[PDB]
């Protein structure tokens, strides 16, 4: 069963180096081509580099020639992107994909999940989590909304769940907005039966792996 998992994405200073790794499973890296495709935030896909491990052959996009080097370790069944002289424009989700083994499919059939690389004058900061307490002045159709406000964090990937993921129906976690401060803040809301408020515990799990921050915040009606 073919699977690709990228890792090694993170925050790096401009001028820095970084190496991304693509763990292949359910095939041989030697027998296929690996590509890196990246996606700058809210942009389209940009092909970066390709390699055939068997005969070192490598090809690169004009935009990263002479800075990036793609390589493979057959003994780990893993391919890599060594990224040097990194600039702000290199900030993106990096996907690792392969050439189909079938030959009759002229395309990248399998992709990984992607890993975010943030190229910025450092600045790692954990988020503050505030309750959006369900209002105890109607503001219900028989359903109440409550949430938590995840505020002032950098660099990017923040995960919010509810009741350690047990609650998914009616959850809306908002795309992060960048503030005037140059820091991110998002909101997670959920709608629940207004009669559950007396009975049910609601906890939002906020995870900011870049700063090593996990917060579990209980959200309940105020009085």
């Amino acid at each position: 069963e073919v699977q690709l998992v990228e890792s090694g994405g993170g925050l790096v200073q401009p001028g820095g180096s970084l190496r991304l790794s693509c763990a292949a499973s359910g095939f041989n890296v030697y027998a296929s081509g690996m590509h890196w495709v990246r996606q700058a935030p809210g942009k389209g896909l940009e092909w970066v580099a390709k390699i055939y491990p068997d005969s070192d052959y490598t090809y690169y996009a004009d935009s990263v020639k002479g800075r990036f080097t793609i390589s493979a370790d057959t003994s780990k069944n893993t391919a890599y992107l060594q990224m040097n002289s990194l600039r702000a424009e290199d900030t993106a989700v990096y996907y690792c994909s392969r050439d189909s083994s079938f030959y009759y499919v002229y395309a990248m059939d399998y992709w990984g999940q992607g890993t975010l690389v943030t190229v910025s004058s450092a600045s790692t900061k954990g988020p503050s989590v505030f309750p959006l307490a369900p209002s105890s002045k109607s503001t219900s159709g028989g359903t109440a909304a409550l949430g938590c406000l995840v505020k002032d964090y950098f660099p990017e990937p923040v995960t919010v769940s509810w009741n350690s993921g047990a609650l998914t129906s009616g959850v809306h976690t908002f795309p992060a907005v960048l503030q005037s401060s140059g820091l991110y803040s998002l909101s997670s809301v959920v709608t629940v039966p207004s009669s559950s408020l007396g009975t049910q515990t609601y906890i939002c799990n906020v995870n900011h792996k870049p700063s090593n921050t996990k917060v579990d915040k209980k959200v309940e009606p105020k009085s």
Binding site: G141, G142, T143, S169, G170, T191, V192, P193, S194, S195, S196
Partner: protein, 268 residues
């Protein structure tokens, strides 16, 4: 049907506001029929029902005099009770007294009551036997010994078994179409979705005269053991109540609401 007559008296101190507030209301069953308010213009016991207005001038001078005597007494009690608990003169405090009697289907005496509270807590109460007092603390035991000496229980017991029951029987006869009525609850159910997978079933009972009502849910066969509001007055003599369940959507048809009320032959 079981019937009752109750009187409710609340006295509240008003440091710096002058004389303390006195309110008295008389009920037959769940129907208010008389009231006095120290703040109101008349300074008289006023009628609060049609069937009481046919009583003569001697009745109204009598009730007014009696309620004025209750208020004058409470005006004292507030001061006495402050002394016992050693409380400040600048603080407002509340004295409450409820008394009345109970008649069975056969309109014969069933029970009598006389309870007394200070700042919303039990002070002293007449027992079941109507010869004896339960005192809630050391302060009320002072009042117990005083009222045993003044033969209070013996003279209340005469009122509760005699005057109270005979005037309740007279009120039941005078206001027959109001007090001996039983308005059955008008019922319906409302539905709202609250979720992709959940929905609220609310069960309404309205325009029912006696407040004694039971609203209970069942699923398939067994009582669903859930939101339930306190029975509330409609403002026109009748009463209202609702009960609700949050039920998984597509499964509303397996829930039923059950209504018990003396106006209904059998439960709905």
């Amino acid at each position: 049907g079981s019937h009752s007559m109750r009187y409710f008296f609340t006295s509240v101190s008003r440091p710096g506001r002058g004389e303390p507030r006195f309110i008295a209301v008389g009920y037959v069953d769940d129907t208010q029929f008389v009231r006095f308010d120290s703040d109101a213009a008349s300074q008289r016991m006023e009628p609060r029902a049609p069937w009481i207005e046919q009583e003569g001038p001697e009745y109204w001078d009598g009730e007014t005099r009696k309620v004025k005597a209750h208020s004058q007494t409470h005006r004292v009690d507030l001061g006495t009770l402050r002394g016992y608990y050693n409380q400040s003169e600048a603080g407002s405090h509340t004295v409450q007294r409820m008394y009345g009697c109970d008649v069975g289907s056969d309109w014969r005496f069933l029970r009598g009551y006389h309870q007394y509270a200070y700042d919303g807590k039990d002070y002293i109460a007449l027992k079941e036997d109507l010869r004896s007092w339960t005192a809630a603390d050391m302060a009320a035991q002072t009042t117990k010994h005083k009222w045993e000496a003044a033969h209070v229980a013996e003279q209340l017991r005469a009122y509760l078994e005699g005057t109270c029951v005979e005037w309740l029987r007279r009120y039941l006869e005078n206001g027959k179409e109001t007090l001996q009525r039983t308005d059955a609850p008008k019922t319906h159910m409302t539905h709202h979705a609250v979720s992709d997978h959940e929905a609220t079933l609310r069960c309404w009972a309205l325009s029912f005269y006696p407040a004694e009502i039971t609203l209970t849910w069942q699923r398939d066969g067994e009582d669903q053991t859930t939101e339930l509001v306190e029975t509330r007055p409609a403002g026109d003599g009748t009463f209202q109540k609702w009960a609700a369940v949050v039920v998984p959507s597509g499964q509303e048809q397996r829930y039923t609401c059950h209504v018990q009320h003396e106006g209904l032959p059998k439960p709905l």
